[PDB]
């Protein structure tokens, strides 16, 4: 069997999980109450796949999810919403206040206590699991919970399980807009966690998705629901290979094998090509070549990072729907012909291809148009270093005068940990600068 455990931490994680599980329930035909009419209608087959859901005796399907948050509000919204009966009652809520945008509160003084309960629930889920593939951890930098508790949980998971893959879908701070004053401190303190213990971390930016929504989707005033739906589409495209049949299927292990040239550079960028409104769905073919070319458009990147300032180290394409390998080969050829896209001279192979037959679904009340073909790209490139540099400068501007430091020091943290994390991040940045130099 092939399955993976989804963990959600913080408000961003919980809301992205709401979107993701809405999409999964729509995909597999599971009603919000957990029942599947197709079981009673057909009496056979496999529709409620084991990759995400577990079937109990009475035909109810319960997701393999673990929600975590220090606030009671965000998860209490879920526990009295449309999906109140879907989830197991074990939701792991800390009956106290929140980390208050403090890494120390989410890592040292309050991030404990409930960590043991969280690990117990993960162990109970794993014991029911056969052939576990890995973990999908959803969180966000800039929040006390999403950083500190993510650090605690990832450390404990690496200690306990170790060899199992641990993917990450995190929201990096945007270059210009943010909703916190102490965001850079948290983002710079989370780098040791994101570097040492994670196996492959996908980063997204709110500003980039806002621009995508404004331009491609023609939504003038988007909110977080659209962002969560887009991220859910990306995650579904990533994990579709474990569930549906396909010509060229790519599981998580062989996916990782062709995207991590070295252990310390596991920071790919993620894009989704056919983001288009219903009105513009007409007047356009949306062939394989069009979507493959659109994957490379700098405007369509979901992190504010221009690929043309760096070199592409590796690329993985995941196609869904009526796609044939001949057109994919043609698209790869014409892309390799182009000179604007620069590839490192030590990776002549370049591209990994995966194809799946199941086309993407349409969420009711959504914005994406129904399409026959889609492609999700993941790309390891050096240009992401620039996205880090703009952050580091900000941190210096706040650490020179020791602003807001006493809040962190008064909850267990030492002053030196800031400098240690900054040095580690500088080492990572210089590693990315080194890997892209042409060989001689």
């Amino acid at each position: 069997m092939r399955e993976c455990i989804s963990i959600h931490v913080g408000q961003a994680g919980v809301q992205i999980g709401n979107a993701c599980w809405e999409l999964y329930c729509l995909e597999h035909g599971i009603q919000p109450d957990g029942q599947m009419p197709s079981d009673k209608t057909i009496g056979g087959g496999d529709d409620s796949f084991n990759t995400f859901f577990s079937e109990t005796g009475a035909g109810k399907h319960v997701p393999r999810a673990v929600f975590v948050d220090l606030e009671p509000t965000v998860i209490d919204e879920v526990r009295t919403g449309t999906y109140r009966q879907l989830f197991h009652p074990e939701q792991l809520i800390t009956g106290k206040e929140d980390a208050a945008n403090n890494y120390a509160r989410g890592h040292y003084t309050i991030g404990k206590e409930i960590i043991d309960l969280v690990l117990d629930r993960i162990r109970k889920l794993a014991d029911q699991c056969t052939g576990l593939q890995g973990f999908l951890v959803f969180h966000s930098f800039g929040g006390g919970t999403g950083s500190g508790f993510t650090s605690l949980l990832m450390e404990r998971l690496s200690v306990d399980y170790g060899k199992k893959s641990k993917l990450e879908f995190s929201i990096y701070p945007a270059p210009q807009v943010s909703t916190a004053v102490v965001e850079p401190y948290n983002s710079i303190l989370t780098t040791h966690t994101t570097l040492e213990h994670s196996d492959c971390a996908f980063m997204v930016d709110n500003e980039a998705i806002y621009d995508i929504c404004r331009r491609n989707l023609d939504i003038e005033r988007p909110t977080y629901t659209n962002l969560n739906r887009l991220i859910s589409q990306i995650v579904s495209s990533i994990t579709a290979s474990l569930r549906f049949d396909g010509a060229l299927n790519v599981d998580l292990t062989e996916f990782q094998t062709n995207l991590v040239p070295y252990p310390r550079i596991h920071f790919p960028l993620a894009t989704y090509a056919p983001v288009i409104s219903a009105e513009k769905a007409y007047h356009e073919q949306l062939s394989v070549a069009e979507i493959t070319n659109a994957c490379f458009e700098p405007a369509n990147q979901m992190v504010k990072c221009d690929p043309r300032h760096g070199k592409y180290m590796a690329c993985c394409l995941l196609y869904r729907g009526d796609v044939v390998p001949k057109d994919v080969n043609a698209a790869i050829a014409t892309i390799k012909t182009k000179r604007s896209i620069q590839f490192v001279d030590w990776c002549p192979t370049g591209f990994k291809v995966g194809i799946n037959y199941q086309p993407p679904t349409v969420v009711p009340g959504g914005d994406l148009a129904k399409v026959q073909r889609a492609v999700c790209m993941l790309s390891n490139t050096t240009a992401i270093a620039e996205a880090w540099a703009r952050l580091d400068h900000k941190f210096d501007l706040m650490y020179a005068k020791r602003a807001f430091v006493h809040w962190y020091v008064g909850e267990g943290m030492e002053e030196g940990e800031f400098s240690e994390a900054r040095e580690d991040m500088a080492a990572l940045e210089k590693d990315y600068e080194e890997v892209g130099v042409d060989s001689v």
């Binding site: 040292y108 003084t109 020791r402 430091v405 006493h406 020091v409 008064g410 909850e411 267990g412 943290m413 030492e414 002053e415 030196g416 940990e417 240690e420």
Partner: protein
């Protein structure tokens, strides 16, 4: 200064030795992974010393008054290696907060005295955060102004404590 501090008088060495033993016994001490008898509180030992001269023709009574201040500070801590829980963690956090304030006032003092000395001589204005903690508040006259002050830094030799030893050396250089 401190109000209602039990300032006593001693005439021989035995009395002050008894006071020293009583004070050391009264200090709050707890065991930790980095030290079996770590200090949980800053400590200040104050000697008020008065010299008087008696002669109606030439001398002055109460001619000299001076203060000897001897300060034992609690060091920085890291919760990972310290292994503190509950009250120990709170004590460590408070100690680190006070030491951060002390480092900030040291650095600000250093920059302020160096600039007006070297730059021109402007002396426009330079706020110094003495009031951010009680430790720096009580030692205002010792860190600057009316005192002659010495700083004794202790250093651990091992490689594992390199990051803390370098910080201690840097702050000694600043001092």
């Amino acid at each position: 200064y401190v109000e209602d501090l039990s300032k006593l008088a001693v005439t021989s060495y035995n009395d002050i030795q008894d006071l020293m033993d009583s004070g050391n016994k009264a200090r709050t001490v707890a065991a930790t992974n980095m030290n079996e008898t770590s200090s949980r509180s800053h400590a200040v030992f104050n000697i008020i010393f008065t010299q008087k001269r008696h002669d109606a023709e030439t001398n002055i009574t109460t001619e000299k008054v001076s203060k000897i201040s001897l300060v034992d500070l609690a060091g920085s801590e890291r919760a990972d290696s310290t292994g503190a829980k509950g009250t120990r963690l709170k004590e460590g956090a408070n100690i680190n907060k006070s030491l951060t304030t002390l480092g900030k006032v040291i650095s600000a003092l250093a920059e302020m005295d160096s600039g007006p000395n070297k730059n021109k001589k402007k002396k426009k204005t330079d706020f110094i955060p003495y009031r951010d903690s009680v430790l720096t508040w009580l030692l205002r006259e010792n860190l600057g102004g009316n005192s002659r002050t010495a700083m004794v830094a202790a250093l651990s030799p091992a490689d594992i404590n390199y990051d803390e030893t370098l910080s201690t050396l840097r702050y000694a250089d600043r001092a």
